[PDB]
C-alpha cells in the first residue's frame, strides 16, 4: 500500500 | 528481515506533453504493483498473486493515490526547474524511494523516504523520521517548504504505522513466495582462451533472494584482483542468476575453487573444475 501524497517539492 | 520499497520515477518531456509518472512496489526482491500514468486507463496493477485477491476497494485506493502522486510530481518537476534556473527545453527526472525495513523481530528497523533529481541525491528523510537532509541550496527550499508543512510528521505516520502493517499483511498472504529461499544450483564452465590460458566461470542459477557472494580461490587465497563479476540478474521467473570468472593457466585449472554463499544453501558450497 502506497503512501498518501504530501506537498510538492 | 524484510522490506517494502516503493520506487517512483517522474520524467518531464517539454513540447511532448505532461511528465510521465511510473511507480513500482516491491516486497524484498519481488515486485507486487505497477502504475504508469501514460497507460490507456491508468490503474494500479497487480504484479504478484498475493495482492491480486485484494478487493476492489484496495485497488481503487492505490489507483487514486498514484493518480494524485503523478499530479503532485508534475508540480514538483516545475518547481525544481525553477529553483535551479534550468531552461524550458530540457528533460528532467525526479525519483523517490521510500519504504520500511523490518528487523528479525518483525519490528520496524528503519523507515526511509528520499528523493533524487537528475540522478543525484536531492533530499532525504533522516532516520529519526523527523528531520531532513538537503543535498544543495535548491533542496534547502524544499526543506523549508516541508518543515513548514509538517510533511515529515505525515511521512513518519505512514512509515511507522501503515507501511509495516501492509508489509506484515503481504508477508503472511504471500508467504509461499515471499518467505522462502531457493538455493543456487551451481556449476563451473571452462572456455579455452588459447593453448595457454582458459576462463573458469562459476555460475549460480535460480536462487532467491538476490543477495549472494561468489568468490574464486587459488590454493586458499582469494582472487580479488583477477575476478570478473557480472551484476546479479533476474531469470524472469522470480529467481536470479550471477557468475564469477577467472582466466587461469592451461593445466592449472585444478588449483582453483569457487565459493558460493547464499541464505538457502544447507552447507558450505565449494566447486572445482
Amino acid at each position: 500500500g502506497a503512501d498518501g501524497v504530501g506537498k510538492s517539492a | 528481515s524484510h522490506s517494502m520499497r516503493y520506487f517512483y520515477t517522474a520524467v518531464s518531456r517539454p513540447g511532448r506533453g505532461e511528465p510521465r509518472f511510473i511507480a513500482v512496489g516491491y516486497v524484498d526482491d519481488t515486485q507486487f504493483v505497477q502504475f504508469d500514468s501514460d497507460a490507456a486507463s491508468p490503474r494500479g496493477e497487480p504484479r504478484a498473486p498475493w495482492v491480486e485477491q485484494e478487493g476492489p476497494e484496495y485497488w481503487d485506493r492505490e489507483t487514486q493515490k498514484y493518480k494524485r502522486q503523478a499530479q503532485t510530481d508534475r508540480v514538483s518537476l516545475r518547481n525544481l526547474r525553477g529553483y535551479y534556473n534550468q531552461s524550458e527545453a530540457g528533460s528532467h527526472t525526479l525519483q523517490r524511494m521510500y519504504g520500511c525495513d523490518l528487523g528479525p523481530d518483525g519490528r520496524l528497523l528503519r523507515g526511509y523516504n528520499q528523493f533524487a533529481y537528475d540522478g543525484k541525491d536531492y533530499i532525504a528523510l533522516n532516520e529519526d523520521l523527523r528531520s531532513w537532509t538537503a543535498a544543495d541550496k535548491a533542496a534547502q527550499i524544499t526543506q523549508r517548504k516541508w518543515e513548514a508543512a509538517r510533511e515529515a510528521e505525515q511521512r513518519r505516520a505512514y512509515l511507522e504505522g501503515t507501511c509495516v502493517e501492509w508489509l506484515r499483511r503481504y508477508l503472511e498472504n504471500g508467504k509461499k513466495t515471499l518467505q522462502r529461499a531457493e538455493h543456487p544450483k551451481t556449476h563451473v564452465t571452462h572456455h579455452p582462451v588459447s593453448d595457454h590460458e582458459a576462463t573458469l566461470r562459476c555460475w549460480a542459477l535460480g536462487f532467491y533472494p538476490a543477495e549472494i557472494t561468489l568468490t574464486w580461490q587459488r590454493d586458499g587465497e582469494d582472487q580479488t584482483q583477477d575476478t570478473e563479476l557480472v551484476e546479479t540478474r533476474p531469470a524472469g521467473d522470480g529467481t536470479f542468476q550471477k557468475w564469477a570468472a577467472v582466466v587461469v593457466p592451461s593445466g592449472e585449472e585444478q588449483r582453483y575453487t569457487c565459493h558460493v554463499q547464499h541464505e538457502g544453501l544447507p552447507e558450505p558450497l565449494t566447486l572445482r573444475w
Binding site: - | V11, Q31, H191
Partner: protein, 98 residues
Amino acid sequence: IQRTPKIQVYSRHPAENGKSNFLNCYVSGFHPSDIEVDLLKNGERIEKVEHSDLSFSKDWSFYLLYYTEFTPTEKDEYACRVNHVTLSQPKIVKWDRD
C-alpha cells in the same frame, strides 16, 4: 549525469536445443531512463517482446528486463540491440549460451 547501460543477454534456463525457454536482455545501471531495446533473431527484430516495469537501484540508476519466449536451435543466432543517449551508435550484444 548520464550513465551507460550494462547489457547482458542470456536465457532463463540453460539452453537446450528444441525445448522452450526465454531469451532475456537485462539492461542496468543507466540514466536517464529513456532507452531502446530490441531482441534480434538472425539479425531481425523480434516482434512480441515484453519488458519489466521501470525500476531503479539504490544508486538511482535504472534497470529493465526485456524477454521473449523462444526455442533455441543449433542454427539460430540471437542478440540484443540497445540505444541510449550515452551510446554513439546502437550497441549489439550477441547471445552466447555461456
